[PDB]
Amino acid sequence: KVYNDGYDDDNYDYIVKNGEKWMDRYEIDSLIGKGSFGQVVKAYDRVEQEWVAIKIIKNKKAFLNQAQIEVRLLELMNKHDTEMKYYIVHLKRHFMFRNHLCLVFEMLSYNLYDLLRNTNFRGVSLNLTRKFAQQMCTALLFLATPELSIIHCDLKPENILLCNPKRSAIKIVDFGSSCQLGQRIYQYIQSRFYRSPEVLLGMPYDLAIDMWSLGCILVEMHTGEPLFSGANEVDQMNKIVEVLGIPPAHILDQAPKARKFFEKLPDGTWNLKKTKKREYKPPGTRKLHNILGVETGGPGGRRAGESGHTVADYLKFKDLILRMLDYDPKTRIQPYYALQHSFFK
Ligand SMILES: O=c1ccc2cnc3ccc(-c4cn[nH]c4)cc3c2n1-c1ccc(F)cc1C(F)(F)F
């Protein structure tokens, strides 16, 4: 009849009540969002006298254990005293409350998907995109710190928050799906739209898969729409192929799940497999040049005449993206050099 002395529901979630005051410190205001992990609530820390976001993990061992991994990584990042640290959301502290693990983060406005929807999915400017791109690259540079070597493993608009409604700063959230560099354990990783080719092909992966995600995200930022919106993995790959063409032979020859998408011809070359529903342009004929509208006033021609949106500006943006969307994770551009690109001058 009751769960956790009546504090929980049948989904092991803590029943959030507005006005409730935790530990004579946190004044619960309202629910921010839900997730598999549990809930995130907006609360006022009367001690520090500031708003905070509390991530209330579900009262069950499986989610508790996963959250402790997140606490480990977040605390690990906190110990490294650099200024790049400030593009990761700050874990202030954590505590147990009524059998729930609670993580206290800084309070941020809204996520990057919310910003897109506010544009009615028409995107934001190349100028705002540049600011976001530089911070993300810096964030990825921080995660590439040898002692950290952290793969976020789930970069997407939803997991990128705006620091202030009137400022251009962003921060990355949700390191619950994250782990450090190591031997391959998991294979079905990342959100589909932003899933790297090496993951789709069932190959070994590293920190480069986050760079791939970033490339997808940045395009989506300026256009307002996902670059590769696959309804499944096969559709996802075919959308990727539409833009970038057939992946190199030296990659496909070593790909365990290559024949889920491709066909090895008698001459040793690879072609797409004939699927089913749906219809795709020939490989590489959906150019990023035309998606971005480099010479046609940007996405939908809505940036024509706008400053910071010349052909030269768009060419710099396109070039950086294509370096981020390299099929080869070993030659794919890295954070340190992404930041040195001409797009960021
Ligand atoms: O969607 C938003 C909108 C605003 C917002 C504000 N603060 C947040 C603080 C922390 C987190 C978070 C930390 N771990 N996982 C999520 C998430 C925060 C947050 N989120 C967010 C982002 C990712 C996510 F998986 C869940 C949320 C949630 F809405 F708060 F639940």
Swiss-Prot record:
Ubiquitous. Highest levels in skeletal muscle, testis, fetal lung and fetal kidney. It comes from the Eukaryota. Changing Y188F: Mildly reduces kinase activity. Does not abolish autophosphorylation on tyrosine residues. Residues 275-307 are annotated as: Disordered. The modification Phosphotyrosine is found at Y7, Y12, Y26, Y44, Y86, Y186, Y188, Y314. The active site is at D154. It is found in: Nucleus; Nucleus speckle. The modification Phosphothreonine is found at T269. The modification Phosphoserine is found at S177. ATP binds at I32, G33, K34, G35, S36, F37, G38, Q39, V40, K55, F105, E106, M107, L108. Autophosphorylated on numerous tyrosine residues. Can also autophosphorylate on serine and threonine residues (in vitro). Residues 26-344 form the Protein kinase domain. The polyhistidine repeats act as targeting signals to nuclear speckles. The histidine-rich domain (HRD) region is intrinsically disordered and promotes the formation of phase-separated liquid droplets that enhance its ability to phosphorylate the CTD (C-terminal domain) of the large subunit of RNA polymerase II (RNA Pol II). Belongs to the protein kinase superfamily. CMGC Ser/Thr protein kinase family. MNB/DYRK subfamily. Interacts with RAD54L2/ARIP4. Interacts with CRY2. Interacts with RANBP9. Interacts with WDR68. Interacts with SIRT1. (Microbial infection) Interacts with human adenovirus 5 E1A protein. Dual-specificity kinase which possesses both serine/threonine and tyrosine kinase activities. Plays an important role in double-strand breaks (DSBs) repair following DNA damage. Mechanistically, phosphorylates RNF169 and increases its ability to block accumulation of TP53BP1 at the DSB sites thereby promoting homologous recombination repair (HRR). It is linked to Intellectual developmental disorder, autosomal dominant 7: A disease characterized by primary microcephaly, severe intellectual disability without speech, anxious autistic behavior, and dysmorphic features, including bitemporal narrowing, deep-set eyes, large simple ears, and a pointed nasal tip. Intellectual disability is characterized by significantly below average general intellectual functioning associated with impairments in adaptive behavior and manifested during the developmental period. This is Dual specificity tyrosine-phosphorylation-regulated kinase 1A. It comes from Homo sapiens. The gene is DYRK1A. The chain holds residues 134 to 480 of 763 of the full protein.
